[PDB]
Structures are given as C-alpha cells and as structure tokens.
Design a protein around this ligand. Structure first.
Ligand SMILES: *CC(=O)NCCNc1cccc2c(S(=O)(=O)O)cccc12
Ligand SMILES: [Cl-]
Ligand SMILES: [Cl-]
Ligand SMILES: [Cl-]
Length: 123
C-alpha cells in the first residue's frame, strides 16, 4: 500500500458528517481492516472531503510530535471521531469507545503530489 493510500484507508470517512452512534468505532475499525491481526489501539477518522484534508498540506506549517517539520495544522476545525480501545477489549473481540468532536487537525505531508501521510493529532 502506498503511504497516501494507507492514510486514506485508516483516516478518511467522507460518507458521514459525524459519528452516528456509540457503535461507529466498532463498525469502522473492522470494515477498514484495522482489527485484522490485532486491535489498533487508537485511530482518528475525519469527516470532510478528501480535497479539504489534502488542502491542509498548504496551511499552517508546524512541528510534528516527533520533531520533524513537515506537519500542517488546518486553519479551520473539522468533524472528527476518535476511536479508542476500552480497558476491557482484547483481540479478537476488539471494543472501542467513540468520541465525536470538531477540532483542528494536524497532518504530516510528503511526496509529489504533496499529500497527507500521517495523522499527528487534533486540537
Ligand atoms: C493513521 C495514519 O496516519 N496512518 C499512516 C500509517 N502510520 C504512519 C505513517 C507515517 C508515519 C508514522 C509515524 S512517525 O512517528 O512520523 O514515524 C508514527 C506512527 C504511524 C505512522
Ligand atoms: Cl497512492
Ligand atoms: Cl485493506
Ligand atoms: Cl490516529
């Protein structure tokens, strides 16, 4: 999988404007194949058009939590859903807590074309 495609598969959900129910994370973590060989412990889905997320690579340049300087913060807030494993959860019965919010996203960009390859954080 290319870096751009992996980002898309793990973080884009443009078909809904916001986390539906408390079971959104259980459904999405499984359908995007993030529960396949293990339970991905934390994952954030973004509910905006791909174009709008790709446009962040030309917005505010900031440092990544890792120290690199190819991170960018979205000027505006975006609809996101944080998916986190609950203290109970254990493979292969992955269980997730769903938290819907509107925050600025931070992503790492790379390549040509220059697009998002990593979800750094939200604020
Ligand atoms: C959620 C997501 O953004 N997936 C892409 C795969 N994970 C990933 C890609 C690139 C970097 C990276 C880092 S790093 O610290 O910059 O090296 C850490 C965890 C996951 C990724
Ligand atoms: Cl690609
Ligand atoms: Cl897949
Ligand atoms: Cl994430």
């Amino acid at each position: 999988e290319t870096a751009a495609a992996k980002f898309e598969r793990q973080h884009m959900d443009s078909s809904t404007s916001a986390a539906s129910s408390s079971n959104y994370c259980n459904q999405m973590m499984k359908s995007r194949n993030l529960t396949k060989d293990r339970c991905k412990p934390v994952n954030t889905f973004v509910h905006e058009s791909l174009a709008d997320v790709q446009a962040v690579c030309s917005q505010k340049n900031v440092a990544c939590k890792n120290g690199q300087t190819n991170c960018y913060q979205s000027y505006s807030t975006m609809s996101i859903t944080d998916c986190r494993e609950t203290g109970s959860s254990k493979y292969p019965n992955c269980a997730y807590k769903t938290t819907q919010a509107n925050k600025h996203i931070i992503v790492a960009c790379e390549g040509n074309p220059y697009v998002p390859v990593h979800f750094d954080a939200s604020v």
